[PDB]
Design a protein around this ligand. Structure first.
Ligand SMILES: Nc1nc(=O)c2cc(CNc3ccc(C(=O)N[C@H](CCC(=O)O)C(=O)O)cc3)ccc2[nH]1
Length: 267
């Protein structure tokens, strides 16, 4: 079992409506999280034979009022009979899933961006990331929506540099026709379907473009080079953003992460 560690910013999961039902196609669909899908994968398939999920790290901090607002619907820990990112009772490999939550808070965000304290903290948070994976002996790490950008953890000769991966909601190949890199990838995919691309995001300035009707998800290295790729999400012009996210999560993302891990295991 290639020891697996998972990282995500809880605030990012709330935005995406993770663990919530969303109206889709005129009715509703449950917006399953990336972790829930992985938990199901580890439980019901041979992928489970290859890995043990060891820790589920999240970086949010309760002392950041913006971090608080962002998960108001969820809350930092599970409330009784209330909304949660997955069912509070979920089990992964005979381990209560909730029991694996870890916070390695990026508190450094309290200080202003670029300030010496902000930077000194960011390094220590990355330093704290490294340290506790090791506390978990993690053989492998997945990032799903972790908002901090790791520049130091993916250093030359650091113990997890090639063992650290991000699942991204779009293709990431340089010369790929459907490449949808960045934090705007889901929205770039929805607007590309309209044959329109956004020139300036603040004021929604746009431009005509050849329609693209497909998107996918990338399981790539973080230092990152693509290790496994899927592109199975047809995109429709009348599609909403909630529909596109779910479909890419269901058509291409869950598969890429699992196939990527499966392949990644004999390495
Ligand atoms: N169903 C439902 N629909 C939604 O749309 C929905 C939307 C949200 C987004 N919440 C946010 C709260 C605060 C910020 C922020 O950045 N604040 C900073 C710091 C000062 C402060 O902490 O206030 C600022 O003011 O500059 C951003 C987002 C949360 C639940 C939601 N639930």
């Amino acid at each position: 079992k290639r020891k697996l560690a998972y990282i995500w910013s809880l605030r990012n999961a709330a935005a995406d409506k993770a663990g919530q039902y969303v109206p889709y196609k005129g009715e509703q669909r449950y917006m399953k999280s990336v972790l829930e899908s992985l938990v199901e994968a580890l439980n019901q398939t041979a992928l489970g034979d290859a890995y043990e999920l060891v820790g589920v790290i999240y970086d949010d901090d309760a002392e950041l009022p913006r971090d608080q607002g962002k998960i108001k619907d969820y809350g930092f820990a599970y409330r009784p009979g209330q909304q949660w990112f997955y069912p509070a009772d979920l089990q992964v490999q005979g381990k209560t899933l909730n029991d694996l939550l870890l916070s390695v808070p990026s508190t450094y965000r309290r200080y202003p961006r670029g300030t010496p304290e902000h930077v000194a903290g960011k390094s220590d948070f990355e330093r704290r990331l490294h340290d506790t994976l090791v506390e978990l002996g993690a053989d492998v790490v997945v990032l799903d929506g972790l908002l901090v950008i790791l520049d130091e953890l993916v250093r030359p000769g650091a113990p997890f540099a090639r063992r650290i991966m991000n699942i991204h909601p779009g293709v990431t190949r340089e010369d790929s026709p459907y490449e949808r890199r960045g934090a705007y990838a889901t929205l770039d995919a929805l607007y590309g379907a309209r044959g329109e691309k956004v020139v300036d995001w603040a004021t929604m300035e746009k431009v005509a473009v050849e329609p693209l009707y497909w998107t996918g998800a990338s399981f790539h290295y973080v230092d990152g080079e693509v290790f496994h790729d899927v592109l199975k999400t047809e995109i429709s012009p009348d599609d909403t953003i909630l529909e596109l996210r779910w479909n890419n999560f269901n058509n291409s993302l869950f598969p890429a992460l699992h196939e990527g891990l499966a392949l990644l295991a004999e390495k």
